[PDB]
């Protein structure tokens, strides 16, 4: 039956409208595979005819128009809309030719305002992905989560925009007819779906220059003349149409904003070149200034002995006109900037009649006229109309809030930025979807493309302005929140992205300083970060604090006691997922405890010296909770630390107690190795928390007091016992089979270096008899072992190279200082 019958068959009309709503639901939020599937059920011809049918009912007509937008437009529209908030300006000749005003002579201070949305826009906007919907093609043999995601179903937009223009032109003149039979039965049904379609196509930028000119003519003809026929704004529309009208206006306001930004970029391009030439000329003239001058050249050459930021600051330091003498620029060049400051404000309507004659005070007049003419009821309509109203008078504040996201790039890297922006669109698109196995591999390869991109390292400022780092930190927050307690679903993407965060911190300190704010925010998420192996939020925090003395100096105390409460939790109970693998039970977690220990090591030790302020508070809070040191050093019930090390070494060497009794999986847990790794990081922590010698000879109370506490803590007799503890050596025999111990399951020389650094920084060596007494027992067998392994077959071994690093990091500098 004809759908026009449903205008009387109401029950069918409601059911089918709800059906169309379900159609717009299943294909919503970038589900282009379902959108392509739906293209079979509703065809291109079906949609186009439903657009052009003027006898269709209201809800069904609106549903079909919205459905067309959902099938074809929304996936590309959302991503492009998001990219409208950033303004990357390449250095191109058409960018150079971009001027604030079109060529005119009406006003010297300011010409007539250019037509919004008409002209050249050089902002880097990624192209859309349109795949013609082909259904007879063979189904791919590739498995899921590896095949590329479906793109938007293609549809002729060049003809579609012509259809849209014809439709709205007919609707405008029908409004002038004031006919008693509106299309769809109501004014809002006659206008809202059409305006929504024009809004979306405007966002895509399908319209040409003349198409936008026609749109302005049908919006308001007389105001938009360059050198019933009445615009839509005088037809007393309903509120829903007013809402879509606001959506139409805000796009042109955005286009004006982008035009201003590009005008600034063009003037910046010309002015920088002129200033570069002038500064070169001044430098060349100042070279011969030494013949007729003297030591007063200091503040002349301060520019050339000072980096460019304050150079341009003092060069531009002439706005108030009370500081001209400091500025060495010629007055005509300064006049160029002053004139360009004049017209920019005039363009923004600052300073330089029933016809507004321009959009700037046309929309403001429109909004105030609507508000005074009737009581607006729709809340989001009020939100939209007053957001516009705030945007009109304030010509500069929006520019001030748009400049931090503005940036200029070299033309040679536009294609480099293309891939980065496309992957940025992909990860941004994943913020609105529940995390899935299909989405993980596409976003891991996206961040891999970020790693491969040169501009990712070349322009850290642009990276920070784009702010992918915070967006990725939310996507971790959601993925850990899903299964926040039970299990970390999609662990591979978690560790692959925290790897990107660690690299991001290492790109630059400004990126690190920006990341420094979220540490506590990262710290709550690090509570379950012990579950994952590899790159973890704790590692991200360490990379966000390390190699900067300024960082960890403003590190708030509240983080510290929560970290050591986690250490207490590590020490009071067995590790859950480690114990679930059939391992024998021990009442504490060496691996998680080690993680916090090396984290605090990065927290308190920077650039080769200890931070005293962080050092005393960490040792104070750590020593307040002795339960996390391990089986030893607890006092009552606590055996020797050295004895616990022989417990760990022999349990590590003996199977069925070090492992599950079943590396084979490259992440096998070795309990004996982990316990002593924890002990080594515990003592390396205390060693790097040790007070400095200059404060010690300074005699300051707390500085002496802490070290005296550490001496009462750790007896040096156990330490020299650990020094005397042997190392398993690669032996020759059995047809030359080298018995090579594995670092994953053997005592490493770097542990011993941790204890050597501790005794050097805390205990020290004062006398010769005990100096030799510590040298001969443990350093001598190891150095002889290294000398013996210094051969053809044993030098290349990990044990030998680790001994080489250990001796040259901890042993040899210690005895170099103890040489006299």
């Amino acid at each position: 039956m004809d759908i026009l019958e449903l205008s009387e068959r109401l029950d069918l009309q409601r059911f089918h409208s709800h059906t169309l709503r379900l159609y717009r639901a299943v294909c919503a939020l970038g589900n282009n595979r379902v959108a392509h599937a739906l293209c079979s059920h509703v065809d291109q011809a079906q949609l186009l005819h439903a657009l052009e049918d003027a006898h269709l009912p209201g809800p069904l007509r609106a549903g079909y128009y919205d459905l067309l937008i959902s099938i074809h437009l929304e996936s590309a529209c959302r991503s492009r809309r998001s990219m409208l908030s950033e303004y990357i300006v390449p250095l191109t000749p058409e960018t150079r030719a971009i001027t604030l005003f079109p060529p005119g002579r009406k006003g010297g201070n300011a010409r007539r305002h250019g037509l919004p949305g008409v002209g050249v826009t050089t902002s880097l906007r990624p192209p859309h992905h349109f795949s013609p919907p082909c259904f007879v093609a063979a189904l791919p043999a590739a498995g899921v989560a590896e095949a590329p995601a479906r793109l938007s179903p293609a549809i002729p937009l060049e003809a579609l925009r012509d259809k849209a223009l014809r439709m709205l032109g007919e609707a405008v003149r029908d409004g002038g007819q004031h006919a008693r039979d509106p299309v769809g039965g109501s004014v809002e049904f006659q206008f809202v779906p059409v305006l929504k379609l024009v809004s979306t196509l405007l966002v895509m930028g399908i319209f040409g220059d003349e198409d936008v000119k026609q749109i302005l003519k049908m919006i308001e003809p007389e105001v938009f003349t360059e050198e019933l026929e009445e615009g839509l704004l005088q037809m007393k529309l309903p509120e829903s149409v007013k809402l879509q009208m606001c959506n139409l206006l805000e796009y042109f306001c955005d286009q004006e904003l982008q035009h201003r930004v590009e005008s600034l970029a063009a003037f910046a391009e010309r002015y920088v070149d002129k200033l570069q030439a002038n500064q070169r000329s001044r430098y060349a003239l100042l070279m011969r200034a030494f013949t007729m001058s003297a030591a007063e050249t200091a503040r002349r050459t301060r520019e050339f002995r000072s980096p460019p930021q304050e150079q341009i600051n003092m060069l531009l330091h002439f706005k108030d006109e009370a500081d001209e003498e400091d500025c060495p620029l010629p007055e005509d060049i300064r006049q160029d900037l002053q004139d360009f400051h004049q017209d920019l404000l005039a363009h923004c309507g600052i300073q330089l009649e029933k016809k507004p004659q321009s959009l700037q005070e046309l929309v403001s007049h429109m909004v105030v006229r609507w508000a005074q003419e009737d009581y607006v009821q729709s809340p989001e309509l009020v939100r939209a109309m007053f957001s516009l109203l705030h945007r009109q008078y304030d010509g500069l504040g929006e520019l001030l809030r748009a400049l931090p996201r503005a940036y200029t790039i070299s033309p040679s890297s536009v294609e480099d930025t293309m891939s980065l922006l496309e992957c940025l669109g992909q990860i941004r698109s994943l913020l609105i979807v529940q995390m899935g196995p299909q989405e993980e591999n596409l976003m891991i390869q996206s961040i891999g493309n970020i790693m491969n991109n040169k501009v990712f390292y070349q322009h850290p400022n642009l990276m920070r302005a784009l702010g992918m780092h915070e967006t990725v930190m939310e996507v971790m927050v959601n993925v850990l929140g899903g299964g926040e307690t039970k299990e970390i679903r999609f662990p591979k993407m978690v560790t692959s992205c925290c790897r990107f965060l660690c690299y991001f911190c290492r790109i630059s300190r400004q990126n690190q300083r920006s990341m420094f704010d979220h540490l506590s925010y990262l710290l709550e998420n690090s509570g379950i970060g012990l579950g994952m192996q590899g790159s973890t939020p704790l590692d991200v925090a360490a990379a966000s604090v390390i190699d900067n003395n300024e960082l960890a100096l403003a590190l708030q105390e509240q983080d510290l006691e929560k970290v050591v409460s986690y250490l207490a939790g590590c020490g009071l109970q067995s590790c859950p997922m480690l114990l679930a693998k059939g391992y024998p039970d021990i009442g504490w977690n060496p691996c998680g405890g080690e993680r916090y220990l090396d984290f605090l090591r990065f927290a308190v030790f920077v650039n080769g010296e200890s931070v005293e302020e962080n050092a005393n508070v960490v040792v104070r809070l750590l020593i307040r909770k002795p339960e996390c040191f391990g089986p030893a050093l607890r006092g009552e019930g606590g055996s020797g630390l050295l004895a616990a090390i022989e417990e760990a070494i022999r349990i590590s060497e003996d199977p069925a107690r070090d492992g599950p009794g079943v590396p084979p999986e490259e992440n096998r847990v070795h309990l004996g190795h982990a316990i002593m790794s924890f002990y080594a990081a515990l003592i390396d922590l205390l060693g790097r928390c040790a007070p400095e010698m200059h404060l010690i000879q300074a005699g300051k109370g707390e500085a002496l007091r802490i070290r005296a506490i550490l001496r009462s803590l750790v007896p040096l007799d156990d330490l020299v016992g650990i020094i005397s503890l042997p190392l398993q050596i690669p032996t020759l025999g059995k047809d030359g089979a080298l018995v090579q111990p594995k670092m994953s399951a053997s005592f490493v020389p770097d542990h011993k270096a941790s204890m050597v650094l501790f005794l050097d920084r805390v205990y020290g060596i004062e006398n010769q008899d005990f100096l030799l007494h510590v040298l001969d027992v443990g350093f001598l067998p190891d150095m002889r072992a290294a000398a013996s392994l210094d051969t053809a077959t044993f030098s290349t071994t990990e044990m030998a190279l680790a001994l080489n690093r250990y001796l040259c990091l901890a042993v040899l500098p210690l005895i170099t200082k103890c040489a006299p």
Partner: protein
């Protein structure tokens, strides 16, 4: 590196343009001044084309400003766990606020016209429900410091300049006929979250300028990044300035309302709480003297720290004067029974060695004269 680096003209053009635009915005556009808020609210507050309809129902449709007021009332009074950020509310509230005050022997003949003009500008707003914006926003902010409570607080001060009695009356009537505790709960939490001086933070700050770390993209000399000691001084000062304004003019029953609320089921004696905060301030100021007493000279950052601390302390004492003036016997009893005396003796002991320390040298004459008006 400064003696070994390259001049400006060898820098890449795209980098140079980025540096130029960054310098340009701070040096020209932020510094640029433009006043438009007066013709904002004149157009919003005026209603047009109702003359043509000439309707006599008395329906009283809102004027364009009043629609804004109703809309923000609706989003203020809607029930949500968190008061989600609205940048337009930032824009409109700042526009709404600073458009009111707009401010050599001036005489009492012409002195009054600026006052009644300020009253006219406030009357343009409080007659339109703008007075309810501050109460609803403070009730809905739930006691967390933020942009909204700052902008709303500045609006409250703006509409309450000169102690507008009628505005105070509207405040009192709304609190009385709504009888909600969340307002004073928010006020108590917000004031309890106000910061005091920290020695550890101060010393950590002191270590920073010894480094004098600059940025890589050029150089900024001793950058003016956010100070971690007394960052919320403007907010705390504004909060007590607002509390002072809502009791200015000896609004006796309003002061008794602050001390106790019969209508409210739960009563929070904010007067006692205010004393508690002043008490918390006295240890910080005393210990900040107890870091400089040994040192013969006080450095510049410490001088600025004293200035911002005592500006807030002056505002607190001015407020505390306001609650008890009139005299309000209930408040006077609350002050006497509270721990005000401990703060008083601590401040006196601080003031004991202030002027003696500062009088030794001529470099602390400023900080001495502001301290002198503080006592």
């Amino acid at each position: 590196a400064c003696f070994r680096m390259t001049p400006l003209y060898n820098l890449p053009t795209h980098r140079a343009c980025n540096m130029f635009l960054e310098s340009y915005k701070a040096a020209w556009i932020l510094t640029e001044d433009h006043s438009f808020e007066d013709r904002m609210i004149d157009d919003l507050s005026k209603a047009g084309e109702q003359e043509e309809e000439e309707e006599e129902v008395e329906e009283k449709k809102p004027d364009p400003l009043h629609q804004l007021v109703l809309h923000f009332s609706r989003t203020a009074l809607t029930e949500k766990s968190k008061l989600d950020e609205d940048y337009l509310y930032m824009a409109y509230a700042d526009i709404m606020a600073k458009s009111c005050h707009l401010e050599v022997e001036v005489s009492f003949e012409e002195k009054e016209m600026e006052k009644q003009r300020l009253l006219y500008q406030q009357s343009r707003l409080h007659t339109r429900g703008a007075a309810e914006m501050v109460l609803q926003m403070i009730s809905a902010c739930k006691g967390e410091t933020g942009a909204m409570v700052s902008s709303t607080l500045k609006l409250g001060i703006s509409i309450l300049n000169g102690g507008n009695a009628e505005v105070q009356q509207k405040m009192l009537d709304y609190l009385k006929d709504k009888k909600e505790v969340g307002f004073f709960q928010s006020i108590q939490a917000l004031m309890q979250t106000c910061s005091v001086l920290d020695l550890n933070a101060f010393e950590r700050q002191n270590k920073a300028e010894g480094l004098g770390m600059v940025n890589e993209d050029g150089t900024v000399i001793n950058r003016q990044n956010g100070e971690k000691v007394m960052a919320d001084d403007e907010f705390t000062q504004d909060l007590f300035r607002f509390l002072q304004l809502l009791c200015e003019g000896h609004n006796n029953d309003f002061q008794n309302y602050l001390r106790t609320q019969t209508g409210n089921t739960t009563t929070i004696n904010i007067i006692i709480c205010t004393v508690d905060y002043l008490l918390r301030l006295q240890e910080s100021i005393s210990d900040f003297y107890w870091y400089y007493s040994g040192k013969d000279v006080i450095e510049e950052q410490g001088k600025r720290n004293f200035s911002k601390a005592m500006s807030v302390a002056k505002q607190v004492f001015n407020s505390l004067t306001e609650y008890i003036q009139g005299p309000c016997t209930g408040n006077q009893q609350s002050l006497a029974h509270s721990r005000l005396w401990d703060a008083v003796v601590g401040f006196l002991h601080v003031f004991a060695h202030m002027m003696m320390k500062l009088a030794q040298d001529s470099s602390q004459i400023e900080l001495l004269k502001e301290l002198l008006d503080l006592q």
